[PDB]
Amino acid sequence: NAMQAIRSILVVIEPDQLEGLALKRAQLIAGVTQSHLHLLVCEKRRDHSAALNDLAQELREEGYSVSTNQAWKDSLHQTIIAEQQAEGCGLIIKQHFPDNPLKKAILTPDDWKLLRFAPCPVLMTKTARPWTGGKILAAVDVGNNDGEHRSLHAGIISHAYDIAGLAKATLHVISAHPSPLSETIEARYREACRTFQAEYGFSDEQLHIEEGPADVLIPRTAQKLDAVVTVIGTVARTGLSGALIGNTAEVVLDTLESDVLVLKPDDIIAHLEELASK
Ligand SMILES: [Cl-]
Ligand SMILES: [Cl-]
Ligand SMILES: [Cl-]
């Protein structure tokens, strides 16, 4: 019940866009989990206090626990992470607004800095489709069961399952294992796969076991299922020079048309919490 355990959600509110999907997803989640909503506008110039008060009043009348703030220091991603630290939020929800209408799935450079440094789960909303009744896709690699991958996969499945339940949606899993006596090593992999299926109670129809590059297999499955949310984890160990997202998550985040919930390994979250608390 990973989502039920999140007791406050940071909702990034845009002042000038015609969609408000960050708050719509926050209302759906908190309507079930009774989580607190902290609404943040990141801007220095205009005084948004009256509009934030009116929005908070309307949500409290609907039964939500709500606080609001307007802040600005240095950059958009730094303002968001500083607010997450001040309010102790366990999830950040932000809507994706692409810089180029001909490259609509590409995240902005500031979105990438938010995903790199956030010391908590980040939900990047990329579609206006409602979650209710849709398909939720979890991305794992059943071919690896070391302590670090077991923990990360358990978190990806816990969050994806809680989302499927609160949205009255169906849950699907994509396992993309790199292409490789070949029949015997395949037995160890088939063993890992059958154990994963029993441990997590997945039907054959829910579990997509595919061989090939994860960076293209994850988006293909999301597109074929018309998934509305994809849950992914960043790489178990950082690459050189602080490259902690990893190539698979970099490509998938810039390609998916679904919303994306980005989780990080516990050891990476702990180090990012230290950096954010400086
Ligand atoms: Cl407030
Ligand atoms: Cl929704
Ligand atoms: Cl990175």
CA distance 153 to 158: 8
Neighbours of ion ligand 1 (CB under 5 A): 67-68
Question: Resolution reached, in Å?
Answer: 1.2
Dmax of the chain from CA atoms? 69
Ligand 3 center from residue 145 Cα (angstroms): 24
Q: Which two tokens stand for residue 190?
A: 């088939």
Residue 242 DSSP label: G
CA distance 182 to 186: 6
> To the nearest 10°, the Cα dihedral for 77, 78, 80, 83?
170
Neighbours of ion ligand 2 (CB under 5 A): 24, 28, 130-131
Q: Locate tokens 């679904």: which residue? A: 258
Cα-Cα end-to-end distance for the chain: 31
Residue 204 DSSP label: T
Which ligand sits closest to the CA of 128? Answer: 2
Residue 239 DSSP label: B
CA distance 103 to 25: 24
Which ligand sits closest to the CA of 235? Answer: 3
> To the nearest 10°, the Cα dihedral for 250, 246, 81, 265?
130
Ligand 3 center from residue 242 Cα (angstroms): 6
H or E segment to which residue 186 belongs: helix 182-200
DSSP 70-127: EE-BSBHHHHHHHHHHHHT-SEEEEE---S-TTSTTPPPHHHHHHHHH-SS-EEEE--
Which ligand sits closest to the CA of 107? Answer: 3
Which ligand sits closest to the CA of 65? Answer: 1
Ligand 3 center from residue 234 Cα (angstroms): 9
Give how far Cα 27 sits from Cα of 2, 164, 262, 274, Å: 17, 15, 19, 30
CA distance 135 to 206: 10
Give the SS3 label for residue 52.
Answer: helix
Ligand 2 center from residue 134 Cα (angstroms): 10
CA distance 38 to 71: 12
Give how far Cα 235 sits from Cα of 106, 155, 238, Å: 20, 14, 7
Q: Which two tokens stand for residue 28?
A: 């759906």
Which experiment gave this structure? X-ray
DSSP 149-180: HHHHHHHHHHHHHHHHHHHT-EEEEEEEE---
The CA R_g of the chain, rounded to the nearest whole Å, is: 19
Q: Which two tokens stand for residue 43?
A: 């801007």
Give how far Cα 266 sits from Cα of 1, 153, 260, Å: 17, 11, 19
Q: Which two tokens stand for residue 258?
A: 């679904």
Give how far Cα 260 sits from Cα of 1, 143, 156, Å: 19, 23, 12
Q: Which two tokens stand for residue 99?
A: 């810089």
